[PDB]
Amino acid sequence: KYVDKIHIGNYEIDAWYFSPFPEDYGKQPKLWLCEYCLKYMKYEKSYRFHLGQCQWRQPPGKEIYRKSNISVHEVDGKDHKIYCQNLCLLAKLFLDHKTLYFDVEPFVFYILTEVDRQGAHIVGYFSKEKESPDGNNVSCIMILPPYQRRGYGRFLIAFSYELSKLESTVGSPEKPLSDLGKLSYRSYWSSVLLENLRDLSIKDLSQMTSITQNDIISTLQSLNMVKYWKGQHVICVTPKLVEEHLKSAQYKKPPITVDSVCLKWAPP
Numbered sequence: 001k002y003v004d005k006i007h008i009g010n011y012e013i014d015a016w017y018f019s020p021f022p023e024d025y026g027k028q029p030k031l032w033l034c035e036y037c038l039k040y041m042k043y044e045k046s047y048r049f050h051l052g053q054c055q056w057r058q059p060p061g062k063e064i065y066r067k068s069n070i071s072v073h074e075v076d077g078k079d080h081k082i083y084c085q086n087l088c089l090l091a092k093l094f095l096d097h098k099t100l101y102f103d104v105e106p107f108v109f110y111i112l113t114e115v116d117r118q119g120a121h122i123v124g125y126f127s128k129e130k131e132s133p134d135g136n137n138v139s140c141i142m143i144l145p146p147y148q149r150r151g152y153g154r155f156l157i158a159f160s161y162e163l164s165k166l167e168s169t170v171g172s173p174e175k176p177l178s179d180l181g182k183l184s185y186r187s188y189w190s191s192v193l194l195e196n197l198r199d200l201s202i203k204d205l206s207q208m209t210s211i212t213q214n215d216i217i218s219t220l221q222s223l224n225m226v227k228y229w230k231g232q233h234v235i236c237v238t239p240k241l242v243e244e245h246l247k248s249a250q251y252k253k254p255p256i257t258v259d260s261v262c263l264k265w266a267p268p
């Protein structure tokens with residue numbers, strides 16, 4: 001019997017996938033998680049006692065972004081091992097393809113929180129390899145179900161690329177992407193590219209955005225905005241067709257934007 005249900009903060013969330021919590025934790029009808037330190041517990045009573053005790057009111061690590069009540073914390077896997085393992089076990093409940101939960105030292109974790117008077121409430125996160133051979137600027141990205149499809153995943157995608165800009169490199173999410181992940185990345189790529197084409201080679205779009213040329217090319221193909229000439233992809237779009245795509249229905253929700261001004265981060 002697996003963990004099939006968690007209580008975190010004020011949310012109950014049904015599990016989507018097996019997550020390797022220890023065998024005695026799985027057997028419980030529900031798992032109780034501290035929304036601040038991510039300690040997981042077997043009983044409501046141990047949960048209630050911890051809430052009276054826990055002094056954390058936000059993630060560990062450094063707050064590398066804060067604009068209004070949106071906050072991102074950078075947490076090194078080697079400096080906060082238990083916390084990051086707890087995060088991974090939490091995320092595996094909603095990630096089918098995630099494989100790594102306890103070997104957290106090679107990763108840095110970017111924790112997205114929504115702040116009120118009580119504290120900084122976890123929304124989701126992405127992990128990133130400290131040294132990515134394959135040039136992946138995201139390893140795993142996960143938004144908790146009650147926050148999904150509300151702008152936070154796009155924010156985190158944009159944030160991963162702002163980091164990639166500050167490192168003077170391009171990056172791509174590690175594959176395979178979840179079903180929701182595929183649509184979010186394609187939607188974000190289109191928006192970023194279409195907005196740059198309204199205001200340029202493919203290599204230029206790559207350097208302005210840190211999106212890989214492959215990701216650019218495939219996004220333009222799905223928009224039917226690239227020509228092929230003797231082995232080379234070439235952008236072929238009119239400023240009118242860009243705008244038709246841009247004012248269409250799906251680009252209408254006002255994003256949470258990443259203000260690079262509010263990003264306090266220097267490249268490793």
Ligand SMILES: Cc1cc(-c2ncccn2)cc(C(=O)NNS(=O)(=O)c2ccccc2)c1F
Nearest residue numbers: 094142143148149150151152153154178184187
């Ligand atoms: C990358 C990603 C992953 C996951 C996820 N979560 C749990 C388990 C597995 N994957 C959820 C979201 C999400 O929430 N997407 N919706 S969106 O942020 O509003 C949005 C709108 C327009 C363009 C882009 C994004 C997401 F973006």
Ligand code: NA
Nearest residue numbers: 012013014145
């Ligand atoms: Na649920």
Ligand SMILES: [Zn+2]
Nearest residue numbers: 034037039054
């Ligand atoms: Zn706690």
